[PDB]
């Protein structure tokens with residue numbers, strides 16, 4: 103780490119005194135999903151470069167930004183452009199915003215990401231309800247909680263066996279049935295690899311053997327610190343391509359480029375997340 | 387893993403301890419969480435707080451400031467470590483394992499490691515003692531190994547074997563002593579997997595750990611063993627099974643009433659006295 | 672962290688302006704496999720400390736010359752993660768090689784055999800890898816990315832060139848070797864300590880045929896560059912995968928049949944210089 107408690111406190115206070123908005127729900131937008139910010143109403147934008155203590159972008163493109171607003175009526179703060187480990191950011195920098203949300207008064211975090219499908223059943227365009235995760239950087243020392251614990255946020259050894267709220271998963275599955283979509287809402291485990299290189303077949307086969315249903319390079323760090331803080335969490339992976347799980351099928355690659363989330367697939371997810379704002383319990 | 391210790395640092399600490407106690411230990415014992423009461427069983431003891439031992443890894447003042455206790459346990463010359471350092475607290479593994487090299491230079495030829503651990507093996511129940519037969523070093527697979535950096539042939543080889551980390555003679559004698567103690571529970575035996583922590587495992591993760599063949603999980607010990615064997619120390623150890631980790635979502639919902647408590651003060655005491663009794667099975671130098 | 676695009680380019684040009692050699696192929700020889708440098712004609716030697724921005728080997732040199740009709744740059748005494756080196760130093764030469772004009776990289780290493788079939792002395796055509804360190808964050812591509820080198824998210828499914836594997840096999844049959852050319856997956860572990868039986872068993876279960884502490888970082892950045900890659904593991908020992916055959920110890924002497932065995936792999940890399948495509 104390198105952030106004092108006061109640092110987080112100072113940022114949350116700064117935001118609070120520059121917006122009349124008071125979010126209950128924070129939403130991290132994954133790659134190709136930033137258009138969720140367009141669905142906010144009465145929106146107020148802050149560029150990261152404007153918010154004190156916020157990690158500076160070293161990356162191509164605009165810095166990314168924090169959008170306060172209402173989403174189907176819900177007080178939300180929305181994150182467009184997350185920090186990734188593969189870009190050389192320490193997890194304590196990646197996850198900083200989650201702690202600020204907590205101090206902002208947020209009690210719920212929704213996480214979205216794009217992911218390669220490991221599960222034969224999954225097809226490009228599917229949305230996966232995240233049931234559970236496998237944190238490989240975590241096993242080996244790369245866990246955002248590393249260092250002295252601050253009891254003002256949470257415990258030394260927080261549980262993650264229950265990180266994906268039972269109630270919101272039951273309600274997502276329920277709300278999805280009224281939507282009348284062609285494909286059922288998938289559910290499974292997100293495995294986080296550090297990237298940025300992509301899997302070899304051999305590696306794709308381990309990830310499969312480890313029970314992971316979909317792979318990507320983000321999210322878990324955030325979820326973990328959310329649960330440390332006692333935030334309610336749920337989330338979705340957009341399956342942007344099927345990873346090749348053998349050499350036979352490796353040769354059979356033809357009219358191919360692992361494209362970003364089909365703009366229509368992204369838009370389906372964005373509007374599902376929006377509609378689910380109806381189903382989060384109110385703080386009260 | 388950027389080792390800020392010269393050989394002369396280790397030697398300076400070792401020699402400092404050697405000129406402030408008359409004790410000359412053969413055996414080092416690392417006390418796991420909740421097992422520190424082992425030190426009370428030492429006779430003719432002497433205490434050094436980490437704070438007064440040059441080059442010893444420094445804290446930011448939490449509740450438990452650890453210490454080293456020299457003395458005789460069941461007749462054996464011992465140095466005993468109460469309060470270990472953990473990776474998850476932010477310490478580099480070269481700080482975690484610094485004491486093991488000091489012990490070598492003290493003249494120790496045997497390291498015993500104790501810890502508390504989650505039970506992965508269905509057969510294990512809360513309060514069990516597991517003889518560590520082997521380990522799986524997940525941090526080591528990815529660069530986080532305490533031997534990372536140059537090798538110093540004055541400690542050991544570049545590429546030390548870990549096939550035989552947990553001494554065979556002592557494992558047979560552990561299992562032997564236990565049988566004639568006449569205990570209600572069988573002495574368990576299996577593989578300890580190190581995960582870096584500090585967050586606990588999800589169900590999915592707990593499953594991988596099972597599939598990897600691990601019988602118990604914790605966040606320590608493996609670093610210390612590895613640098614012990616690099617020095618040629620005899621190693622043996624135990625995990626006290628503190629809780630059983632949930633390994634299916636079905637039993638996750640049913641997880642209602644409770645939390646992962648510390649080592650039940652009774653079961654710890656049982657281990658602590660088994661360790662004392664096993665002092666008479668360690669070979670002489 | 673570490674090296675900018677200029678730095679690579681300055682190193683490349685220094686070498687270009689300090690040798691008449693213009694190499695097409697680069698060969699990173701592993702442990703005990705550097706005798707291949709003696710077979711180089713017109714050989715021109717550079718110690719690493721001599722070269723701008725190079726990592727200082729703290730017995731490491733760069734050798735240019737012709738092997739079996741091919742302009743080569745040879746690396747004797749590679750960098751290892753266990754030695755304390757960060758992966759961006761480990762893989763620094765691979766990009767210089769690219770800016771030198773090299774289009775093929777051949778990698779050799781010493782490995783422990785996880786596949787029961789494998790015997791000491793076997794050569795393994797590396798067909799694929801498992802980068803265990805890379806899962807957790809130790810990946811040489813981590814950090815800012817320059818597109819003059821390659822993509823942000825490069826593929827590694829075809830890291831080991833289809834054509835050269837077919838030609839390795841083809842030459843091997845032509846060589847009339849009694850022992851078959853093994854082929855499989857190399858898992859990179861960080862080291863330096865060797866595997867426990869428990870750990871060997873997970874590596875086996877993971878699908879790895881051979882284990883070592885190098886190579887993968889180089890292959891990854893080479894492919895990020897668009898270099899053609901093929902490589903070999905010499906099986907120096909069968910890794911103990913149970914406790915029964917841990918008791919059983921032997922007429923110990925892993926070493927000196929490893930000369931005939933390392934020679935075989937060296938002479939095979941030589942032969943294969945004729946099978947690498949031209950630019």
Ligand SMILES: Nc1nc(F)nc2c1ncn2[C@H]1C[C@H](O)[C@@H](CO)O1
Nearest residue numbers: 133216217218297317318319342345
């Ligand atoms: N097989 C795969 N592995 C990983 F790690 N990511 C994959 C992927 N396939 C697609 N993706 C998408 C998801 C991320 O948004 C983006 C990387 O940040 O690429």
Ligand SMILES: Nc1nc(F)nc2c1ncn2[C@H]1C[C@H](O)[C@@H](CO)O1
Nearest residue numbers: 419502503504603604605628629631
């Ligand atoms: N499921 C579990 N996973 C891990 F890593 N550790 C567990 C655990 N259950 C109990 N413990 C014990 C080990 C230490 O004594 C203490 C803190 O690491 O808690």
Ligand SMILES: Nc1nc(F)nc2c1ncn2[C@H]1C[C@H](O)[C@@H](CO)O1
Nearest residue numbers: 712713736737738739740741742743
């Ligand atoms: N002095 C030299 N100059 C050049 F241009 N090539 C040399 C050489 N000595 C050996 N060779 C090798 C490389 C050519 O591919 C090959 C001739 O086609 O022989």
Ligand SMILES: Nc1nc(F)nc2c1ncn2[C@H]1C[C@H](O)[C@@H](CO)O1
Nearest residue numbers: 702781782783860882883884907910
């Ligand atoms: N059983 C084994 N396990 C691991 F990890 N590596 C092994 C090995 N046998 C040989 N090696 C490789 C790696 C060293 O860098 C190199 C020593 O020269 O040989």
